[PDB]
Write a protein that binds this ligand. Structure first.
Ligand SMILES: [Mg+2]
Ligand SMILES: [Mg+2]
Ligand SMILES: [Mg+2]
Ligand SMILES: [Mg+2]
Ligand SMILES: [Zn+2]
Ligand SMILES: [Zn+2]
Lengths: 368, 184, 368, 184
DNA sequence: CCAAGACGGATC
DNA sequence: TACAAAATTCCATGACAGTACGATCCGTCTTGA
DNA sequence: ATTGTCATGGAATTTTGTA
DNA sequence: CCAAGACGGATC
DNA sequence: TACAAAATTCCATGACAGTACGATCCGTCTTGA
DNA sequence: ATTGTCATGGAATTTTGTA
């Protein structure tokens, strides 16, 4: 600190400081003549304090902090001392927005058979229609067949009663849902375990994980909106009509309706398809198996130019769900324990326990 | 001539005045013509109002071409005739005093009559909660002649809950004495 | 309708129907043997009704509606009859989402001199600090200098009292603001007209129009958040500190602070720049004019592959601001009266009057 | 030697006990050393508490290197000395009974003394609302010797409101009689 | 029949 | 074996993500004297 | 311990009818 | 000292 | 006139857009008998 | 009658010190 600057003034060379420049003492402080101007060189011990003083003014990044220090001070490797202080500041790490996008979105394989994967979700608190407010939506992963159930509450008892009428048709293998209170409850967990159904849960605050039910909710709302144009919002009576409509709707990219993918033949619905009229049911079901297997699979989009991929041991920060006014929108730095896929990891959170979080609600810790 | 298909003919019938369970007394039995798939709906009365309410939940999933039923008042009513006319369903009524459905439908209807009473003995007030597991049992019963269950004929695949072992559906010695004591 | 189908059955040729196919009458209806199967050809008068019947099932697009009609019916140019019915349906036009992105965002020229353009906006209802809830933010268009004013209400009287202390320094040419009640008021309109200041207003529900104040609000909130980590949210006393901090903050892309761009020399602020120490003030102001003129101008980004550009006479639909539950999020079709720029147009709205709306809240009317 | 710059020296002074206007009685006058830019702040008392409160709004925009003031109690207080120490401002006090500021500062201070009284005659209770337009008038007054207004020296450009014509700042015949009647 | 008010609308 | 146009496929685009409520002013429709 | 999805409607490409 | 409850937390 | 590394520029990325409140269940901490 | 903007922090490129 004082020994490095003392040898520099008398002509002796130290690595970092160029020999071409003139070094002189003025006002009890070591200064250097530079093309930018006369700059003061501080001792090593004071350098840690000065960077902290210039940073804590407005809590700025690498370049904006240096430009404040460059007004008066100069030393070898200034940015290396700035970046080091940038990773130390707790206030900056949990507030600043990430400049790295998430990795390419995975497109998981469509369920092989019907009743293999069940996607369930409520469509919020709709305007009061005959006492009912909520709608439980069950979407099949394979076919895309939708069952609608009107409920007064997003409770466990309302979910059980509605699914018991549905499970009368067929028992599903795996039921996928978001981490709602009705689905994360122990009563619903013991309900599925009794019938031999595995419960699958979406990553917290990541609604696109269970997209097959979320995208269907868009088609349900869009159809209900069009049917209630210029009319009072009574949707309760329209639910059985909407259910029948969307299940018999042709998908332009799939070429088949959710009804045609589930049964094989169209019912007595308006504009029924009668192409397999000549063939027998045994031949119709054999053709149905060939259709289900030979459906298109959406290819994964190319990775963005600046995308980060999570690895084991990397420091990451979890996003705060609903941050209060003037409160940090990121949690304290946490270590990755295990990587399930390039989109989902298990991390030891701020509380101090195992938590499965998607990478969209995560950012890599800066300055490492 | 076209071969028999699903949703061609829906056989509907009520089964007796069963003991009260959660306010319900009657069961609407819906049997498909080709597949033999069974739909059970709990009702409070053998009326048209209860038949329309239960079938509206069924027709939202799939609509039959022809509905078959006996000369019951709930089906032969003009209100039920207007109900089927709106959805474009032809009504077929069997001759009085002697019904006609076929061997596959009648053998299925015979199983529902005896399976419900088998589970009813000992617990007559708790048949409502058994309705889901009764529907699963009937639709996954290994066909007597054919090698396809009602689930396999309707969807094309085998069910996730296959009923491997079968009880003879018959009432045991002490189950007969308890059933003869509940009435008298 | 009946004449075209009658001549077709007896062998005589009509344009549209291919002569290679066999046409026969069955069940009192004209049918055709096709590779897809036996399809019924309806008369011209019934074709308009059939397309309407198949569409009103689920209110579907071009391909999804046709696939319902293709189950039973066939005629020459089916899609031309479908698209025609798609433009007639009022329910579909005001509910369906647009598949065309907006044109490339314009980057308007930075104000030439200080006090030429003033950007003002409130930062919502912040948590109660010493009675105050709102903060009036004034951003200079040229320099980026920010003046902060604590207020209890987003009212006209609160805006006038705060600006009267500011206009004591210098009178601005044009004041830009969003269409808030305090700024659109006649009292505020007569306030600016008295001092000879032109009022500029942002397009309704388009916050990025006045971005110079909106982006600065992000820097104000981010700095206030970091200063209140682990502390009760008292922001009232921190406002004069935040004001001084952000105005002396170096912009990494501009190389100069809002303070340096406004005055030319740094004040007695911590880490003050003393490069123009040797030069006189007359030489310092001459250098300041050269700096202001030679600042970078962000080039406009390339237009997207599927973008629409508004023209005079084109039918467009205005976006509903805050749509109710199960209610249309688009207004009735409206005609463009005048195009100001490729981003802003004047339209005769649903009410029946002139309205200046940005293209982001607008979509081109489908099927024209 | 370095040439004179803005924010080098800030001359602060109170101007008399003016008639009550919206609760305010005193005016804190802030004059820059080089540019001659004038900041006016309404205060209720000639106290340190009122001086600190008004200067905190000014220092949030720009901080002076040196603050110059007379031997007034509001400036010579230990509380004001600690206030300037925290922000890193050196305090300079003029000799008692005879102040020293310079020709440019004293000629500017002379204009503020007479411009306020010119607009005060006829309406002594309404000087608070004139404060913004008085500040604009002083900062855009065409310099007597130099060819640059206080606005042009501070920002570098000409103001949007340039005061083209000048009244002689002198009181007219009947304005003198009204001013001599308000006191007696 | 008119002055202070009540109320939905527009926008943030 | 080559046209022109219909028919079909391609694919960027946006919306689904628990939502309703307050605060300001303005233009319009009340309710007692 | 888990993961985006798909209707839409102009444009881009392929098929079709008749040489 | 314990049974019904009160309450913030987590997630939608 | 060539290195290696520091110094500087480049630039994709996200957040600013009036926000707080309710409804469900669960784990934990009460309050009278 | 009007219009996106800019801090951030890794990567991409240029400058620098000393041959
Ligand atoms: Mg949910
Ligand atoms: Mg009967
Ligand atoms: Mg605002
Ligand atoms: Mg004095
Ligand atoms: Zn920081
Ligand atoms: Zn429609």
């Amino acid at each position: 600190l004082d020994a490095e600057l003392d040898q520099l003034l008398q002509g002796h060379y130290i690595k970092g400081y160029p020999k071409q420049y003139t070094y002189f003492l003025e006002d009890g402080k070591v200064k250097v003549s530079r093309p930018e101007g006369v700059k003061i060189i501080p001792p090593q011990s004071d350098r840690q304090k000065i960077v902290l003083q210039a940073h804590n003014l407005a809590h700025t990044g690498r370049e904006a902090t240096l430009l404040k220090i460059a007004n008066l001070y100069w030393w070898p490797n200034m940015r290396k001392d700035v970046v080091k202080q940038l990773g130390r500041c707790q206030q900056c790490l949990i507030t600043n927005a990430s400049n790295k996008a998430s990795g390419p979105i995975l497109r998981p394989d469509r369920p092989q058979k019907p009743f293999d994967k069940f996607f369930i979700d409520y469509i919020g608190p709709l305007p009061p229609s005959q006492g009912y407010l909520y709608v439980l939506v069950v979407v099949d992963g394979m076919t895309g067949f939708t069952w609608l159930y009107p409920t007064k509450a997003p409770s466990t008892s309302a979910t059980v009663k509605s699914l018991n009428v549905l499970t009368s048709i067929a028992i599903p293998k795996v039921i996928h849902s978001d981490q709602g209170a009705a689905f994360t409850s122990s009563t619903f967990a013991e309900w599925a375990k009794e019938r031999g159904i595995h419960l699958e849960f979406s990553t917290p605050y990541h609604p696109q994980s269970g997209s097959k039910v979320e995208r269907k909710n868009s088609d349900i709302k869009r159809l209900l909106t069009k049917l209630l144009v210029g009319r009072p919002t009574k949707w309760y009576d329209l639910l059985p009509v909407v259910q029948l409509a969307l299940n018999n709707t042709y998908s332009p990219v799939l070429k088949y309706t959710p009804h045609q993918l589930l049964f094989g033949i169209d019912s007595n619905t308006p504009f029924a398809n009668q192409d397999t009229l000549d063939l027998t049911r045994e031949e119709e079901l054999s053709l149905l198996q060939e259709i289900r297997t030979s459906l298109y699979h959406p290819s994964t989009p190319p990775a963005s130019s600046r995308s980060w991929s999570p690895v084991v041991g990397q420091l990451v920060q979890e996003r705060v769900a609903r941050p209060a006014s003037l409160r940090p929108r990121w949690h304290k730095p946490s270590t990755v324990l295990k990587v399930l896929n390039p989109r989902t990891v298990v991390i030891l959170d701020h509380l101090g326990n195992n938590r499965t979080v998607s990478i969209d609600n995560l950012k890599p810790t800066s300055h490492q | 001539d076209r071969p028999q298909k699903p949703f061609d003919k829906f056989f509907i019938d009520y089964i007796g005045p069963l003991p009260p369970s959660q306010g319900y007394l009657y069961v609407l039995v819906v049997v498909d013509g080709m597949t033999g798939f069974t739909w059970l709906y709990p009702t409070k009365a053998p009326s048209t109002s209860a038949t329309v309410k239960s079938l509206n939940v069924l027709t939202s999933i799939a609509i039959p071409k022809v509905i078959h039923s006996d000369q019951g008042a709930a089906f032969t009513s003009s209100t039920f005739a207007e109900w089927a006319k709106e959805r474009g369903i032809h009504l077929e009524f069997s001759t009085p005093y002697h019904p006609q459905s076929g061997s596959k439908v009648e053998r299925k209807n015979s199983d529902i009559k005896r399976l419900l009473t088998k589970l009813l003995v000992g617990r007559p007030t708790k048949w409502y909660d058994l309705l889901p597991v009764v529907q699963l049992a009937l639709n996954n019963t290994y066909s007597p002649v054919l090698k396809y269950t009602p689930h396999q004929l309707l969807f094309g695949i085998d069910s996730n809950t296959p009923f491997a072992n079968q009880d003879t559906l018959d009432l045991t010695r002490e189950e007969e004495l308890s059933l003869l004591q509940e009435i008298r």
